Design a binder for these strands. Structure first.
Lengths: 254, 703
RNA sequence: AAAA
RNA sequence: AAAA
């Protein structure tokens, strides 16, 4: 399908590449500060109603990266000293570029990125006994940063997502682009978002936050995921986003 | 006895003839000579079972009458039960799969052979060497100690496996050239396949062409997170010890519930186990229950951190051997189910989508009920009661550390020997030394040394194994290097094998070294940075000799502020091990370095390349024991200037300024003055690029 | 190999 | 993290 890519152009280091649950968190929060809980309730309605956001992924210049579907890991058997070696780099790769992501979905041969346009950096400081602690920062290469996908009505985007994201930039600037992802029709899907599943999935990595999510790249069969309202005593009800961002995916019979 | 115990013990003792024919005790071939040895042994001591077991080494009419003379009823067997045992073990011997002076040839290098010795970790390092005759006076000494030990052993597979392991690991199973299979391994896989055929309900070519066997594999995943992410060294060893017990608890559970023997364990090393079992409905139901119950327990105990992936594949006798490599092909279909299962982690818990006594981690542990006084730690099925020298052991099975000798344990107790590399530096207090005390013992800079090591392409090596007994020799020999000999290497043994290695000091009597883990094909070791640096080279050399020079390690080294949390140290050395692998294997990441990012400049060194650099440069600048040469006491500046020059080569390897500078201020480093065209044409770095690996280490030693 |  |  086609989507709106929200490019976060960074004005300094980030602390995390945010996944869908924290992007929804921040967006929901911003909308509360701007239009009140009335508007938070409408944002939730639009998402439950079919709207979706992905987790944030790297971009470099005009290159968009997407999560490597876990579907290809069992399929990698599709030399003797080249299979094992490449096979261990396919298993280690977190991201493919758009073109290679679309090939992986159809179980066709694809290549891995050689560079990732960011670097996780553990910065050390002595804590006066003395100990050493680390704060991780994401330094972006030049004309690089992070983007997420929006799927749904333009009026929900213009009225909630766009204004939320500018408020959130206040550190980053925001620009919007059309992105087309060619995906095969299939009973099975990849999520571009972390998700609270309603069924047991096909293939998955777990993600503990306390909440148990399946990771971006996990494979589901007709799992739309779900949101959780819950009470932490902190005035407003808090909504937790765990809806799936499905793209169709060809599986090998295993 | 019972048919089970009989078929297992018979599988084991089928080939005891081989060492007696080669000791020249009874003139005949191994078959008859084996019968004679056990019959002679039965009449000695007076244990009639040895005459019943004697039948195994030998159109049935004669045997039917020999079986009747023995009166099966005396042992609670039918005549018919014994015929099956004999036919089963005979088939098991084929599926498990010429002078008599021929030694065992090395599974690592079939062109080289082992001298005759008994398995002893306290004695000399097994080194494949030149092919020698073993005298029928070495075999005669063996067969006597073998006869003395069998006279005393209770005659259960758990009291027999060890004495067969002491004495027959370094014996060729068949005296042909290029033969790789240890007799002990051939024996344990024959017992393994025998008991499985019995349990699969087959009797009197049926089980051979049918899928009557299961290959069971268990792989733990998240071991790094379970071990290295916490909140101290004590804790790290305790988690490592804990994982090994959890793994044994699951392995012995499967053996117990399927009615199998320790001989059915092909391997249990590095968080991987493989078991041969019967393919019955009862067995698959029993595995699913165990798999489900072990996963639920892991989830409750450690959350999503430590998963256990357990899979089994239906397999036929055909597939235990070649037909043009069906065994490797079967092992490949099993691996694939394990990868799928590792992408369905905790999928056996439908509920999924809705330490005070640890640190203390004596002669072993008793495997008892979870509810029992004295239980120090609990696994998914059983409690573990520490077994102390001055105390009595508790439990059905007893795990005994670093011996093949049952010791003063009760006769009803199943003997389970386990080997673990647990070397550690003893402190004035007598406790295991801390990160701080190890760092403090360093030459020059006080930093903690950390090394992570890995055999290169182990998976490849194991998949050129045709047979269970071959794989069994491969896995055991590989495991024993790490579990058995790394302690000895740390103590300073095998000096003549090891030779001159990169070194900053005289090797201490009691090294400032603590093992976190050494087993399977891997090690994680910490200590004084200069001792860890040297130990990388000692271990790589010992390992090269242990193999035939046909297998290689890669190592990641790092030198850290003693206050650096484990998780960082483990990530940095993990990254450097991965780097050494990706740059071509048989490499060491010696120290953190800068380089041109021109795709031509490797961060790690080929082991021999670093060793030649050290030989060439270290003696010209370094006296030893924290001391620069006298020449260099007032010119220590030359060393920093070379590193400053090397930085301008890193800035641009193509800009030829660095070469003008090298000529002007240098006859201590002549091979760095001229530009080396040979390197330029070969698309490789200038010698200056490599020199930091030696200089940075000397400058650390001499601060 | 943002422990370049 | 090549069987930790």
């Amino acid at each position: 399908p086609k989507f709106i890519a929200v490019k976060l152009i960074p004005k300094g280091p980030f602390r995390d590449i945010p996944r869908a649950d924290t992007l929804f968190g921040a967006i929901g929060n911003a909308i509360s500060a701007i239009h009140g809980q009335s508007a938070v309730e409408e944002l939730v309605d639009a998402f439950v109603g079919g709207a979706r956001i992905s987790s944030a992924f790297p971009y470099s210049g005009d290159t968009y990266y997407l999560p490597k579907p876990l579907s290809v890991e069992p399929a990698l058997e599709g030399d003797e000293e080249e299979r094992y070696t490449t096979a261990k780099r396919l298993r280690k790769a977190k991201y493919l570029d758009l073109k290679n992501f679309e090939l992986a979905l159809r179980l066709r041969p694809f290549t891995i990125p050689e560079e990732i346009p960011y670097a996780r950096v553990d910065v050390p400081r002595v804590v006066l006994d003395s100990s050493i602690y680390f704060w991780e920062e994401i330094r972006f290469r030049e004309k690089s940063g992070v983007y997420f996908l929006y799927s749904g009505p333009r009026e929900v985007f213009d009225g909630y997502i766009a204004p939320a994201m500018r408020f959130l930039g206040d550190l980053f600037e925001v620009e919007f682009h059309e992105m087309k992802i060619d995906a095969p029709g299939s009973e099975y899907s990849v999520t571009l978002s972390n998700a609270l599943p309603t069924k047991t999935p096909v293939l998955w990595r777990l993600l503990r936050k306390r909440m148990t999510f399946i990771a971006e790249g996990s494979i589901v069969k007709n799992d739309p995921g779900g949101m959780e309202r819950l009470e932490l005593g902190l005035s407003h009800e808090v909504y937790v986003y765990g809806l799936t961002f499905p793209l169709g995916v060809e599986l090998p019979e295993g | 006895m019972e048919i089970d115990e009989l078929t297992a013990l018979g599988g084991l003792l089928h080939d005891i003839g081989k060492p007696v024919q080669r000791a020249g005790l009874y003139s005949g071939d191994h078959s008859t000579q084996g019968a004679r040895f056990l019959r002679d042994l039965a009449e000695n001591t007076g244990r009639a079972e040895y005459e019943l077991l004697s039948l195994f080494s030998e159109n049935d009419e004669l045997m039917i009458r020999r079986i009747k003379e023995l009166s099966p009823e005396r042992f609670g067997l039918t005549m018919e039960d014994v015929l099956n045992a004999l036919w089963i073990v005979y088939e098991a011997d084929n599926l498990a799969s010429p002078q008599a002076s021929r030694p065992l040839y090395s599974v690592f290098n079939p062109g080289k052979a082992y001298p005759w010795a008994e398995l002893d970790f306290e004695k000399e390092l097994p080194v494949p060497g030149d092919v020698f005759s073993i005298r029928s006076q070495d075999y005669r000494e063996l067969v006597k100690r073998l006869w003395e030990e069998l006279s005393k052993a209770k005659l259960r597979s758990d009291r027999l496996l060890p004495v067969l392991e002491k004495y027959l690991t370094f014996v060729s199973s068949v005296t042909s050239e290029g033969n790789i299979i240890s007799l002990y391994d051939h024996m344990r896989m024959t017992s393994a396949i025998a008991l499985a055929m019995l349990r699969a309900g087959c009797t009197a070519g049926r089980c051979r062409k049918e899928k009557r066997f299961l290959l069971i594999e268990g792989d733990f995943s998240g071991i790094q997170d379970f071990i290295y992410r916490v909140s101290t060294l004590k804790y790290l060893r305790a988690r490592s010890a804990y994982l090994e017990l959890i793994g044994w608890d699951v392995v012995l559970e499967i053996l117990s519930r399927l009615g199998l023997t320790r001989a059915n364990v092909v391997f249990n090393a590095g968080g991987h186990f493989m078991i041969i079992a019967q393919n019955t409905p009862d067995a698959v139901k029993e595995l699913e229950e165990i798999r489900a119950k072990a996963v639920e327990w892991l989830y409750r105990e450690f959350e999503s951190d430590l998963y256990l992936a357990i899979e089994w594949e239906p397999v036929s006798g055909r597939e235990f051997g070649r037909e043009g490599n069906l065994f490797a092909e079967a092992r490949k279909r099993l691996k694939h189910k394990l990868t799928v299962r590792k992408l369905k982690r905790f999928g056996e818990i439908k509920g999924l989508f809705e330490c005070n006594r640890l640190v203390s981690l004596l002669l072993g542990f008793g495997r008892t009920a979870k509810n029992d006084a004295g239980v120090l730690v609990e696994g998914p099925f059983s409690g573990f009661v520490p077994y102390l020298q001055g105390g009595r052991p508790v439990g059905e099975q007893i795990l005994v550390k670093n011996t093949l000798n049952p010791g003063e344990i009760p006769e009803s107790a199943q003997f389970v020997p386990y080997f673990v590399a647990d070397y550690f530096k003893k402190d004035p207090k007598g406790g295991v030394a801390t990160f701080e005390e190890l760092s403090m013992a360093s030459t020059g800079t006080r930093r903690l040394g950390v090394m992570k090591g890995d055999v290169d392409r182990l998976g490849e090596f194991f998949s050129s194994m045709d047979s269970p007994s071959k794989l069994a020799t491969a896995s055991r020999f590989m495991d024993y290097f790490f579990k058995g000999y790394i302690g000895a290497i740390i103590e300073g043994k095998f000096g003549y094998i090891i030779g001159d290695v990169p070194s900053l000091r005289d090797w201490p009597e009691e090294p400032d070294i603590v093992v976190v883990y050494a087993g399977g094909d891997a090690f994680f070791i910490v200590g004084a940075w200069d001792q860890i640096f040297e130990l990388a080279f000692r271990v790589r050399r010992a390992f090269n000799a242990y193999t035939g020079g046909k297998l290689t390690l890669s190592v990641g080294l790092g030198y850290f502020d003693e206050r650096t949390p484990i998780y960082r140290m483990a990530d940095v050395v993990s990254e450097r091990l991965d780097t050494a692998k990706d740059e071509g294997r048989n490499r060491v990441f010696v120290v953190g370095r800068s380089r041109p990012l021109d795709g031509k400049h490797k961060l790690s060194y080929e082991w021999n390349h670093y060793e030649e650099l050290w030989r060439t440069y270290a003696p010209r600048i370094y006296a030893g024991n924290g001391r620069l040469k006298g020449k260099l006491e007032s010119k220590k500046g030359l060393l920093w200037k070379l590193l400053e020059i090397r930085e301008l080569y890193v800035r641009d390897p193509n800009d030829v300024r660095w070469a003008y500078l090298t000529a002007y201020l240098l006859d201590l480093f002549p091979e760095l003055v001229g530009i080396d065209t040979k390197a330029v044409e070969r698309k490789e770095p200038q010698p200056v690029y490599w020199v930091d690996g030696v200089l940075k280490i000397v400058l650390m030693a001499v601060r």
